[model samples]
Target: RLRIGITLHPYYSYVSNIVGDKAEVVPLIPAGFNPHAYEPRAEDIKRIGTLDVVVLNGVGHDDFAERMIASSEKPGIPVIEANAKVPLLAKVVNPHTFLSISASITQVNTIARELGKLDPANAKAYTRNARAYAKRLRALRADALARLNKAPAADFRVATIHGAYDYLLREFGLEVTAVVEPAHGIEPSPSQLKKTIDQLKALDVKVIFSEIDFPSTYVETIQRESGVKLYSLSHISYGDYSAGKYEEEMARNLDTVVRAIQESGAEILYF
Candidate 1:
């Protein structure tokens, strides 16, 4: 009977998946709004006030949720900071922890533990559901890794259009060589875009990943100039609030990564 308010689409999936039939998951933001720049509405605050608990990134992406909660009449309602247990990226603390399997498993466990404390009657149920969900995620991780391993380990060099996927790439022994966009949702300057192209060329990075949501306006130019192939990764922060969206989008993102690596390996051979 716990009413849980989730801050973003990905959080909706996480909370819904972990809670199962034990609780109701409310998505605080309407579908298709940008989490980076979403403004809180008065209605948002009123909706937030009805929840017993709000689950949020609380690190970078969903600040609007925090603002809405503060403005709500029920500001004292407890918040479960899902990112609290996940290891943050060193300097900026990227908020896309939901995109990585390891980080997300940690988040599920933390959320289950927090909710268990709140509703002791269903504590074991929440923990059991969370563990079951985590098991599926672990299996997905193994499958993704097995598919990615088909490409040579040396072909893992990659660049990103934005900084969000460093955690995800790290899961597969890959890392970002260059980030083309200067900041989240910010278009790069002409000079900065040119500089990124040159750096990609120098680093010999043959594959680059761009977000399916906020695609780079400069990516086509970079591809033409540097001959680097562009691949897409879902931030998993968009679309309708569904229990299955996280796994569906994460699976698509993994397919892109493996396909990109294989194509890049072939390009190197043919060239």
Candidate 2:
């Protein structure tokens, strides 16, 4: 077994939940902390010095991961970027793509394979586990797609705190009209908020989408003013309704889109 370090909590959970004792997985990133705004304390910097392999989500998602690794001053142990393995999957912005089950599953297979190539001593175990995990990932994606298939099509434009679902929505054939991230870090400018409201009023989009961890109060204002419903999609794995849950969460998300569109009195066509 090899000792590995993970920078994000979600992947850390993933490493432990699935990989188990294959590698000594240490979860370095804290809970409920947004990676984009994270600032490493001296202790966090110190911890980075002690790891053998560091797995990171490289898309500018975690602003601190690269810096912390350098500051740790350990150049011998390789820092693996799980996303870079799939340089051309889909157009993705933001660094938190790993939290998306769709994206993470795609990246994990790459992560597993790289670990084997880099750490030749444990290639056998890494190869076997990587294949198994990839199979599990395939099933999860198939199931979510099926579940999403069950729900009727939605034509209403959607919005969210993070633009994480742009690929997923595009894959599922949903249009994303706008995102809050373009406005500000967590707060939107008055012009941005006003512009969003106008877009909603124009019926360009129906739902004021929010993520699980964020406070919904601000989005509620958009809903109230636009007379649109606030629809939340879980960013973290909460239950079986995940797209990774294959059908359950995909179906649930489909239902969410349908209901939000209906309740908002939007007359969008469904195929």
Candidate 3:
């Protein structure tokens, strides 16, 4: 069996679904370590020596993997770039493509194709499984869009505590008006926070999406001061690796977005 290394939680789900029992999906960094702030460890580097290939987010999200791979025994191991075909947001490189259904499917197909080149015997199975997986993912999005019924109103402006949801929001024809955090994992200063609150009110942003797993007290302050409805979203970086994790969390994330739109729309109607 091939030992396939993965960099992030979402990739674990993607690779696991693509390979099934034909290969072993090994996580480079164990669970509970924040991917944003993770440092390479000797033990984790050693594990890479036992793997046949490493799968990477390849965007900005998993740069740590590069350093780890460089020091590992298999420095020349075949690496798969999951976002090679993903259409990234312009200006800034938001590495959260895995959060979107369409982009995820693109990455899935990329992985399956590359894995096929490495193992020709399993090529057909990989392609077949990728299609089945993509279909199910499409259903998740279709179900959410069906519930939404129509696009949000033109004035339904939204903001987020992190800059990770652009790709996900684009699926619903929605866009983020402002991002609160200075950068990923970096908290905004008091002055910056105040400015964000003022800007949200000025922009008339109706909803602010905060991280469900990494909550901050400042988010509460922003909502209380800005008076915008607050909704939490999963970043899908935490917890144990599971094949169904992406679908499960994304289902909740989609439902939360639908609820935010409906609830915020009702508030606008009342106003």
The models' CA-based lDDT, in order, is 0.82, 0.61, 0.91
- For TM-score, the strongest prediction is 3
Each candidate structure's count of clashing pairs = 0, 5, 0
lDDT of 3 by residue, 103-153 (tens): 999999999999999988899989999999999999999998788755689
Report the lDDT tens digits of candidate 2 across residue range 78-166: 87777875533334455545534456566766677677776676667666665665566557556556544243345656777666666
Report the Cα lDDT for residue 118, model 3: 91
Tell me, by lDDT, which candidate is best. Answer: 3
lDDT of 1 by residue, 18-103 (tens): 78888999888888877776878877789976789998788788888777888899888899999887888765677778889999
Error of 3 at 97 (Å): 0.4
Worst 10 residues of 1 by lDDT: 262-271
lDDT of 3 at 185: 72
Poorest stretch of ten by lDDT in candidate 2? 239-248
Q: Which runs in model 2 stand beyond 4 Å of their true positions? A: 87-92, 99-102, 148-154, 237-271
C-alpha lDDT (0 to 100) for residue 229 of candidate 3: 88
